[PDB]
Design a binder for this molecule. Structure first.
Ligand code: CHL
Ligand code: CHL
Ligand code: CHL
Ligand code: CHL
Ligand code: CHL
Ligand code: CHL
Ligand code: CLA
Ligand code: CLA
Ligand SMILES: CC1=C[C@H](O)CC(C)(C)[C@H]1/C=C/C(C)=C/C=C/C(C)=C/C=C/C=C(C)/C=C/C=C(C)/C=C/C1=C(C)C[C@H](O)CC1(C)C
Ligand SMILES: CC1=C[C@H](O)CC(C)(C)[C@H]1/C=C/C(C)=C/C=C/C(C)=C/C=C/C=C(C)/C=C/C=C(C)/C=C/C1=C(C)C[C@H](O)CC1(C)C
Lengths: 219, 238, 220
């Protein structure tokens, strides 16, 4: 499974004609879901694959960077502001942005200098993604290797393709989780592990349907 | 090899490398030297080709020419907007009595007592009803925007984006081939700048609620306290 | 009127002869020549987009019906608690629950989880049979099956089947546009669209949309 014409598909047993003919099983996670036909052209398919994997890895990094201060708030370090949709306000505090609640570790003051250093590093490392650099030169722009794999888990090509489909499946689940974090931050106003604590406190009232009313206009 | 006055560009007759940096494969790109693989369909024969189709929406050439049309029309509309958003505020800071010179509250001027004074003057436009204004707008704009796609009284078989006949190039700036090809990429770069600035006008009106020239004065007075980050706490979900 | 071929009724009329796409011939129902955005250049994107348009159309038709017939039907008789459509989901949380005709002896719907779970389970196989296969037919036209969906059989002659297709897509595009209108004129008024209709019919000059134009201006 997971590659070829007899692979795992998005409808499963009901997925023998709805899958498009141009989604042949060579690329990872090709579950055959192009119901709007946007990746019919091969250049659109390649660019959307690049966008999907980069969005995937940014989403899983964002998922861990959002939930790990919540798990450490469960663990016991207070934080400048554990809540991820209130985490940017640590640099607006009086003590600044302490990293692990440690005032002698980051202690950031200027949000403008943080954005300047952030864009000066990120523009360089995002432009290095396109056309090689100190890490690589002319590799696969989605799977470079040889400088970002110090352990090098890409040795056997069958296990490499297995890790590819595992990565893209964890990535679709990660963008799913980050979209959930986005639309349950705005309707609840509490952190996501805190929403897990509400849903584990009473599972039948602390749902999305407790807050399913608040977005009516009402003049 | 080359003397000092040629490096400054004194002589505008021997400039043939002027279109070499905006057309052809040896042109400037979007990430500069950090953009190696230019998309193979963006060959640089069109104005504004910085090799940027990262989402890949313009791989097909028919979709690409429709997107070029949409880009130039949005560019000219946002250019007219970004000129027509700040100039009521500029003339209010001049001293011309425009009563609500911010662009995001100028539509509500027609619900006032005295209607819509144009330059703050009842001798001007003095339009009262929004209904007849929108009616003559949809009639005039239907006629004009329907003349746009398949021709009309100001040109029939001309180009759909650059007609340039006796009505849309009356001053005659685009008679020369190289001057027209240079002012095409000048037009689309000024239009992309004004599209970005109109998006900035939209987001600045949404999250601040003040004037864009008021935003410019509140950034000129305090740059480090009154940045975009002091309004970053305005959409916190409670 | 022809609705097919090169001389079809187009979306700009006289202004539609230079705009008209070369990939958009007089084949499919409702082709007024409107692809100014350029999103139907390759025919399988056009196939998925025609499928998307017809499914959105056939959903928005019943959406407009389920919008206005509670409000109109409450205007005639049969009173409800929350008769408007966009508070209609809140009747689950009522002390008497959502009822179909309002009377207490029909359904007694207090749970939102059971209804959502049941409709997800049945529409999984329903929309999966819509995608492909199914007991009512597998290899038919996926947009226009017929067979076990036509008890009356109005698709007999290809001419009346074609004109039924074009009036289907025209009623559906009207329903999608009007459902967009329902969506936006719910949120700018907070009041029902039939009640918006009586508010417009009471004062056409000053109880139109432009009375709610200064509503969405940002503060501070
Ligand atoms: C056999 C039954 C079966 C069916 C019917 C489906 C179909 C589905 N699979 Mg699935 N699969 C099935 C089995 C299997 N799948 C997979 C592998 C996968 C993968 C990898 C993926 C899927 C995904 C999906 C979903 C894609 C369609 C969609 O996005 O929903 C469209 C319909 C809705 C969203 C309706 C939602 C229900 C409800 C009405 C919502 C409530 C509405 C709100 C109240 C309205 C909002 C209000 C306002 C404010 C906006 C859908 C649930 C994809 C997915 O998860 O996307 C989300 C996906 O990535 N499947 C395997 C392994 C081989 C299966 C095994 O048999
Ligand atoms: C692209 C990823 C990204 C996303 C989705 C967000 C979105 C957010 N930022 Mg954030 N930021 C992001 C990157 C960055 N931010 C910031 C600097 C800030 C600040 C100073 C603040 C936010 C705030 C917010 C939150 C309020 C918006 C909302 O609707 O809830 C939300 C989590 C606000 C917040 O956390 O509420 C108190 C806030 O004050 N962000 C920097 C530094 C330049 C970033 C780097 O790219
Ligand atoms: C070599 C360095 C170099 C770098 C790093 C860039 C960078 C860029 N150029 Mg380029 N250029 C570079 C060289 C050159 N450019 C140009 C000429 C142009 C033009 C004409 C254009 C560009 C554009 C771009 C952008 C295209 C990608 C994009 O849209 O990012 C978008 C993503 C980001 C910028 C990152 C996101 C911002 C922020 C850091 C994170 C979010 C912060 C918030 C706090 C988040 C909170 C929000 C919440 C609420 C959701 C990108 C910023 C285009 C542009 O301006 O697009 C905007 C464009 O039109 N360049 C020339 C002349 C030939 C160059 C010569 O070397
Ligand atoms: C010859 C004159 C003629 C004119 C002017 C039009 C006009 C139009 N027809 Mg057409 N038609 C015409 C002939 C005919 N039409 C049709 C049958 C159809 C159909 C079936 C359809 C059209 C549609 C259209 C529209 C397509 C272009 C567009 O999207 O506008 C874009 C520009 C606008 C919409 C601007 C107008 C709105 C307003 C002035 C601006 C609103 C400003 C807001 C305050 C800003 C919003 C606030 C922000 C914050 C959100 C356009 C409005 C399509 C349509 O209805 O799309 C909606 C459509 O489906 N026509 C027939 C029968 C064969 C014709 C016969 O000659
Ligand atoms: C068919 C699509 C659909 C849409 C657009 C809505 C949205 C709505 N529901 Mg409903 N629901 C929908 C189906 C379902 N709902 C529910 C369960 C409930 C409950 C329990 C409640 C609602 C309420 C509401 C209304 C007010 C909430 C709101 O945020 O208003 C603002 C939003 C609108 C007015 C709609 C604007 C359009 C929308 C933003 C865009 C539509 C495209 C979506 C992105 C696609 C989402 C569908 C996906 C899953 C395929 C509003 C009409 C609440 C209510 O009525 O009390 C006041 C309420 O308590 N819904 C179930 C189960 C559904 C099955 O599909
Ligand atoms: C036997 C199980 C089954 C169930 C419960 C449904 C359920 C539904 N289908 Mg259907 N379908 C089913 C089999 C099939 N459908 C389809 C192809 C379609 C299409 C094209 C459409 C539907 C639509 C619908 C809805 C409107 C009822 C209807 O079709 O009136 C008779 C409803 C949710 C419509 C819809 O969802 O829009 C409201 C719609 O447009 N179905 C095929 C392919 C031949 C099937 C195979 O057996
Ligand atoms: C500054 C932006 C800019 C630039 C460089 C160009 C450049 C060009 N345009 Mg474009 N155009 C623009 C904005 C711009 N345009 C906008 C905003 C509109 C919509 C109103 C148009 C509508 C348009 C049409 C319909 C046509 C052109 C044509 C041309 C070409 C010849 C005319 C010329 O050289 O103008 C040079 C431009 C300037 C020197 C800018 C002067 C700005 C003045 C001083 C301000 C006046 C503002 C005014 C009040 C706005 C209301 C009108 C050239 C490629 C013609 C063409 O391609 O001919 C072959 C043609 O047919 N353009
Ligand atoms: C075709 C279906 C349809 C119908 C029957 C109506 C009917 C109505 N709408 Mg709805 N509306 C529709 C589509 C529709 N609209 C669409 C597609 C949109 C999205 C742009 C809206 C957005 C909208 C808002 C935001 C509001 C209304 C309101 C209203 C009511 C007053 C009319 C008004 O203010 O004009 C609004 C009309 C539009 C924005 C465009 C509708 C398209 C029409 C059919 C084309 C114009 C033809 C017209 C007769 C000639 C105008 C001449 C001149 C003024 C230009 C009225 C009951 C208002 C209300 O609730 O009143 C109390 C209100 O607040 N509507
Ligand atoms: C390139 C690329 C590439 C890759 O690959 C992909 C992607 C990313 C997708 C792409 C991108 C894209 C983009 C960026 C877009 C954007 C756009 C815009 C911003 C526009 C504006 C736009 C804008 C606009 C139109 C504007 C306009 C304006 C107007 C009309 C006017 C207005 C006005 C005025 C005068 C003032 C008064 O009081 C009123 C009003 C009326 C208000
Ligand atoms: C053509 C063209 C051309 C060129 O290309 C350009 C462009 C522009 C791109 C294009 C256009 C497009 C468009 C116009 C689109 C639109 C759409 C829509 C609006 C839809 C709606 C749509 C809409 C819809 C679906 C709706 C639906 C609904 C439903 C189902 C449901 C409903 C309901 C009911 C029953 C009742 C309850 O109590 C509530 C509810 C639940 C609510």
């Amino acid at each position: 499974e997971f590659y070829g014409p007899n692979r795992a598909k998005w409808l499963g047993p009901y997925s023998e004609n709805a899958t498009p003919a141009y989604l042949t099983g060579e690329f990872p996670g090709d579950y055959g879901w192009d119901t709007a036909g946007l990746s019919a052209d091969p250049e659109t398919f390649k660019r959307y694959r690049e966008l999907e994997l980069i969005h995937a890895r940014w989403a899983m990094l964002g998922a861990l960077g959002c939930i790990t201060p919540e798990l450490l708030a469960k663990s016991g370090t207070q934080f400048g502001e554990a809540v991820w949709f209130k985490a940017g306000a640590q640099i607006f505090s009086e003590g600044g942005l302490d990293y692990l609640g440690n005032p002698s570790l980051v202690h950031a003051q200027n949000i403008v200098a943080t954005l300047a250093v952030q864009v000066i590093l990120m523009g360089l490392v995002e432009g290095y993604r396109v056309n090689g650099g100190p890490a690589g030169e002319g590799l696969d722009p989605l799977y470079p290797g040889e400088s970002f794999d110090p352990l090098g888990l890409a040795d056997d090509p069958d296990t490499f393709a297995e890790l590819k489909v595992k990565e893209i499946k964890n990535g679709r689940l990660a963008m799913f989780s980050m979209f959930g974090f986005f639309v349950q931050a705005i309707v609840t106003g509490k952190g996501p592990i805190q929403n897990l604590d509400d849903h584990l406190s009473n599972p039948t009232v602390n749902n999305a349907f407790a807050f399913a009313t608040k977005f009516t206009p009402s003049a | 090899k080359k003397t000092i006055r040629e490096k400054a560009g004194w002589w505008s007759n021997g400039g043939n490398e002027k279109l070499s940096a905006f057309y052809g494969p040896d042109r400037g790109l979007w990430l500069g030297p950090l953009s190696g693989t230019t998309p193979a369909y963006l060959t640089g024969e069109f104005p504004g080709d910085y090799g940027w189709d990262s989402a890949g929406l313009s791989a097909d050439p028919e979709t690409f020419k429709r997107y070029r049309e949409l880009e130039l029309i949005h560019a000219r509309w946002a250019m007219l907007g970004a000129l027509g958003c700040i100039t009521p505020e500029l003339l209010a800071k001049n001293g011309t009595p425009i009563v609500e010179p911010v662009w995001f509250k100028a539509g509500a001027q027609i619900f006032a007592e005295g209607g819509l004074d144009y330059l703050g003057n009842p001798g001007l436009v003095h339009a009262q009803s929004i209904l007849a204004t929108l009616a003559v707008q949809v009639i005039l704009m239907g006629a004009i925007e329907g003349y746009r796609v398949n021709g009309g009284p100001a040109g029939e078989g001309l180009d759909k984006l650059h007609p340039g006949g006796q009505f849309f190039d009356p001053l005659g700036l685009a008679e020369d081939p190289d001057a027209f090809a240079e002012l095409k990429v000048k037009e689309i770069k000024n239009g992309r700048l004004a599209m970005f600035s109109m998006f900035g006008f939209f987001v600045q009106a949404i999250v601040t609620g003040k004037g864009p020239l008021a935003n410019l004065d509140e950034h000129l007075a305090s740059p480090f306290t009154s940045n975009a980050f002091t309004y970053a706490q305005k959409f916190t979900p409670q | 009127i022809e609705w097919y071929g090169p001389d079809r009724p187009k979306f700009l009329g006289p202004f539609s002869e230079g705009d008209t796409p070369a990939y958009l011939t007089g084949e499919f129902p409702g082709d007024y020549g409107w692809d100014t955005a350029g999103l139907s250049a390759d025919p399988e994107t056009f196939k998925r987009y025609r499928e998307l348009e017809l499914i959105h159309a056939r959903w928005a038709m019943l959406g407009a019906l389920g919008c206005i017939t509670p409000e109109l039907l409450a205007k005639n008789g049969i009173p409800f608690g929350e008769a408007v459509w966009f508070k209609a989901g809140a009747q689950i949380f009522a002390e008497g629950g959502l009822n179909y005709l309002g009377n207490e002896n029909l359904i007694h719907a207090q749970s939102i989880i059971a209804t959502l779970a049941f409709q997800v389970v049945v529409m999984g196989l329903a929309e999966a049979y819509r995608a492909n296969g199914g007991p009512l037919g597998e290899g038919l036209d996926p947009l226009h099956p017929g067979g076990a969906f036509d008890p009356l059989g109005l698709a007999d002659d290809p001419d009346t089947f074609a004109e039924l297709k074009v009036k289907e897509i025209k009623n559906g595009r009207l329903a999608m546009f009007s459902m967009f209108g329902f969506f936006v004129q719910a949120i700018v008024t907070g009041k029902g669209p039939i009640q918006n209709l009586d508010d417009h019919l009471a004062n056409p000059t000053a109880v139109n949309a432009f009375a709610y134009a200064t509503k969405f201006t940002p503060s501070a």
